[PDB]
Design an enzyme around this catalytic site. Structure first.
Site, PDB file in Angstrom:
ATOM      1  CG  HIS A  78      34.791  23.599  56.361  1.00  0.00           C
ATOM      2  ND1 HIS A  78      35.017  24.425  55.287  1.00  0.00           N
ATOM      3  CD2 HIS A  78      34.257  22.502  55.949  1.00  0.00           C
ATOM      4  CE1 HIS A  78      34.375  23.916  54.392  1.00  0.00           C
ATOM      5  NE2 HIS A  78      33.546  22.653  54.708  1.00  0.00           N
ATOM      6  CG  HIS A 237      34.346  17.850  53.171  1.00  0.00           C
ATOM      7  ND1 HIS A 237      35.376  18.431  53.552  1.00  0.00           N
ATOM      8  CD2 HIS A 237      33.213  18.522  52.803  1.00  0.00           C
ATOM      9  CE1 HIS A 237      34.800  19.918  53.679  1.00  0.00           C
ATOM     10  NE2 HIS A 237      33.518  19.786  53.462  1.00  0.00           N
ATOM     11  CG  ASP A 241      30.435  19.462  55.352  1.00  0.00           C
ATOM     12  OD1 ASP A 241      31.249  20.662  55.794  1.00  0.00           O
ATOM     13  OD2 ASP A 241      30.156  19.455  54.071  1.00  0.00           O
ATOM     14  CG  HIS A 264      25.439  22.393  55.268  1.00  0.00           C
ATOM     15  ND1 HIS A 264      26.771  22.493  56.140  1.00  0.00           N
ATOM     16  CD2 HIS A 264      25.739  22.185  54.193  1.00  0.00           C
ATOM     17  CE1 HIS A 264      27.779  22.222  55.388  1.00  0.00           C
ATOM     18  NE2 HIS A 264      27.342  22.010  54.055  1.00  0.00           N
TER      19      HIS A 264
HETATM   20  C1  LIG Z   1      30.782  24.622  51.649  1.00  0.00           C
HETATM   21  C2  LIG Z   1      30.340  23.296  52.426  1.00  0.00           C
HETATM   22  O1  LIG Z   1      31.108  23.149  53.391  1.00  0.00           O
HETATM   23  C3  LIG Z   1      30.619  22.345  51.368  1.00  0.00           C
HETATM   24  N1  LIG Z   1      31.267  21.097  51.687  1.00  0.00           N
HETATM   25  C4  LIG Z   1      31.556  20.470  50.468  1.00  0.00           C
HETATM   26  C5  LIG Z   1      30.821  20.992  49.377  1.00  0.00           C
HETATM   27  N2  LIG Z   1      30.397  22.258  50.051  1.00  0.00           N
HETATM   28  C6  LIG Z   1      29.610  23.053  49.206  1.00  0.00           C
HETATM   29  C7  LIG Z   1      30.647  24.013  48.561  1.00  0.00           C
HETATM   30  C8  LIG Z   1      30.102  24.339  47.261  1.00  0.00           C
HETATM   31  C9  LIG Z   1      31.224  24.713  46.045  1.00  0.00           C
HETATM   32  C10 LIG Z   1      30.850  24.924  44.669  1.00  0.00           C
HETATM   33  C11 LIG Z   1      31.572  25.099  43.661  1.00  0.00           C
HETATM   34  C12 LIG Z   1      33.259  25.338  44.295  1.00  0.00           C
HETATM   35 CL1  LIG Z   1      34.419  25.382  42.683  1.00  0.00          CL
HETATM   36  C13 LIG Z   1      33.332  24.863  45.440  1.00  0.00           C
HETATM   37  C14 LIG Z   1      32.387  24.764  46.389  1.00  0.00           C
HETATM   38 ZN   LIG Z   2      32.095  21.138  53.870  1.00  0.00          ZN
END
Ligand SMILES: C[C@H](O)c1nccn1CCCc1ccc(Cl)cc1
Ligand SMILES: [Zn+2]
Ligand SMILES: [Cl-]
Length: 299
Positions: A78, A237, A241, A264
């Site tokens: 991010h 999003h 990413d 990723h």
């Molecule tokens: C962290 C990564 O950048 C990303 N972008 C979108 C989803 N994600 C994975 C996050 C995983 C995640 C799992 C549970 C909760 Cl509450 C909040 C986030």
């Molecule tokens: Zn993300």
């Protein structure tokens, strides 16, 4: 000529790791020309420096994670998107903990941080990686690919099997600019699903996750009380990413990126394949602003 940029000033911030759950202090600093983005762990003796480059990426399982033997810096994507988004070439990032602060789960707060500090032009030519020919990576059903393009275009396609999406696949395509990034990509939040709640926390993940820093999705609907910042927020999003992950290339891209159920792991898998494939790229600089394709916010 089109010059490199850095921070005009020091700024401090403070927040929490999404996966770790720890409080963290983040400091951003101006840096010298050709430095790139370096990540510094100030809570270690001595201080440990992991440059932000594709070759230092370790874990890619639920975040982008940099590795220098023992030491790690976690969830860099991010912040690295905001920086690519405003054309920041050189900056020092200091962390007091293993993970970058989640903030609101978007690149918006880091964009606010960079604009308040200001951009400083540097007396050195800005370099870009130009995609000369197509490069691709496939991991069963998932796929990602760089194609030649006269500018910067990110495209994404997501084929979730969750009731929230009404049987459909999500698609958005962005023509990158500094102006389009901040209103169009930067406010798009991180998301979790109710149905990963057992699995997620068994492996000590999303320990800091809540409605205050992510879209929490129940089987029936989005639980967050004011819903979605964009109709297509999930997919904007996924674009946020990628932009971030690709910037570990160390330089701005003239080219097109396309993602199909990618994440990723694959994104990093694509950069490394491109670096290896020397025939498929070159480095370039611009004598004149008018001849250059990609447009950045002016200091
Ligand atoms: C962290 C990564 O950048 C990303 N972008 C979108 C989803 N994600 C994975 C996050 C995983 C995640 C799992 C549970 C909760 Cl509450 C909040 C986030
Ligand atoms: Zn993300
Ligand atoms: Cl650590």
């Amino acid at each position: 000529m089109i010059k490199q940029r850095t921070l005009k000033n020091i700024i401090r911030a403070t927040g929490v790791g999404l996966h770790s759950g720890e409080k963290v202090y983040l400091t951003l600093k101006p840096a010298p020309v050709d430095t790139g983005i370096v990540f510094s762990r100030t809570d270690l003796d001595p201080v440990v420096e992991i440059p932000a480059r594709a070759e230092n990426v370790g874990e890619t399982t639920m975040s982008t994670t940099l590795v220098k033997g023992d030491v790690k810096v976690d969830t860099v994507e991010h912040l690295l998107s905001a920086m690519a988004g405003l054309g920041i070439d050189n900056a020092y990032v200091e962390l007091s903990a293993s993970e970058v602060p989640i903030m609101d789960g978007s690149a918006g707060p880091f964009v606010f941080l960079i604009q308040s500090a200001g951009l400083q032009e540097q007396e050195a030519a800005k370099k870009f990686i130009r995609i000369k020919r197509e490069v691709s990576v496939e991991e069963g059903d998932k796929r990602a690919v760089f194609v030649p393009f006269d500018g910067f275009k990110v495209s994404f396609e997501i084929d979730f099997d969750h009731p929230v999406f009404r049987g459909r696949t999500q698609q958005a395509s962005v023509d990158f600019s500094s102006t389009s990034f901040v209103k169009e990509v930067s406010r798009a939040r991180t998301f979790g699903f109710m149905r990963d709640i057992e699995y997620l926390r068994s492996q000590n993940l999303a320990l800091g996750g809540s409605v205050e820093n992510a879209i929490v999705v129940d089987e029936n609907r989005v639980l967050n009380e004011d819903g979605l910042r964009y109709e297509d927020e999930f997919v904007k999003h996924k674009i946020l990413d990628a932009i971030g992950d690709l910037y570990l290339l160390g330089n701005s891209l003239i080219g097109e990126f396309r993602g199909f159920k990618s994440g990723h792991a694959l994104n990093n898998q694509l950069l490394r394949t491109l670096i290896a494939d020397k025939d498929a790229w070159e480095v370039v600089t611009f004598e004149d602003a008018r001849t250059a394709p990609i447009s950045y916010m002016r200091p």
